[PDB]
Amino acid sequence: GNTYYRVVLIGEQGVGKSTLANIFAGVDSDCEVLGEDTYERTLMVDGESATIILLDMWENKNEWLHDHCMQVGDAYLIVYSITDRASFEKASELRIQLRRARQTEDIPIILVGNKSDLVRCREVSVSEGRACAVVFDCKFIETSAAVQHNVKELFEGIVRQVRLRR
Ligand SMILES: Nc1nc2c(ncn2[C@@H]2O[C@H](COP(=O)(O)OP(=O)(O)O)[C@@H](O)[C@H]2O)c(=O)[nH]1
Ligand SMILES: [Mg+2]
C-alpha cells in the first residue's frame, strides 16, 4: 500500500496486451490470490521495491468487466498498434472514457504504441503518438512486445509515474 501498484492494460483487440502481460510475468508472498487474467511481479525501480498487480482482462466482447477495469486501476497502459489506425483512435476514446469514470483523480497513464518491429506496416507516426499523449496529459512510449523492445522501460515508467502523484 505504497509499495503496491494496480496496473491495467486496456486497448482494442490484437494490439498486444496479452503479449505485453506475458513478458512482464514469468517467475513470492503477496497477500492477493490472483484471479482471472491477473499477474503479480515485484520490481526494483530507482532503488525501491514495487509490487505490480497487472490486469489483462479487457476484451471487446461479462460486460461489467469494462466498468470494473476502469474503476480498480491505480494506473493504465492504453495500448494501440502502430500498424493500425483504428486502434489508435480507439485509444483516445478509451482515454476520454477513463477520464469520465475517474473525474476527480489524477490517473497515471502511458499511451503505448505497440508493434514497432513491423516497420513497413506503420500507419501511425511517432509524432502522432507524442502529440496525442500531450493532448491527454499522459506519457508515451513505443514498444515491441514480440522482441521485448522497451517493455522493461514501460513498466518501470508506470511505477515511476504513480509515485510522482503522491
Ligand atoms: N510483430 C509483432 N507482433 C505482435 C506484437 N505484440 C503482439 N503481437 C502479435 O499480435 C497478435 C495478437 O496479440 P495479443 O497480445 O493477443 O493482443 P491482445 O488482444 O491485445 O491481447 C499475437 O499473435 C501476437 O504475436 C509486437 O510487438 N510485434
Ligand atoms: Mg489479449
Swiss-Prot record:
The gene is GEM. This is GTP-binding protein GEM. The lineage of its organism: Eukaryota, Metazoa, Chordata, Craniata, Vertebrata. Could be a regulatory protein, possibly participating in receptor-mediated signal transduction at the plasma membrane. Has guanine nucleotide-binding activity but undetectable intrinsic GTPase activity. Its main location: membrane. Belongs to the small GTPase superfamily. RGK family. It is found in: Cell membrane. GO terms for molecular function: calcium channel regulator activity; calmodulin binding; GDP binding; GTP binding; GTPase activity; magnesium ion binding. The chain holds residues 72 to 243 of 296 of the full protein. The keyword Lipid biosynthesis does not apply.
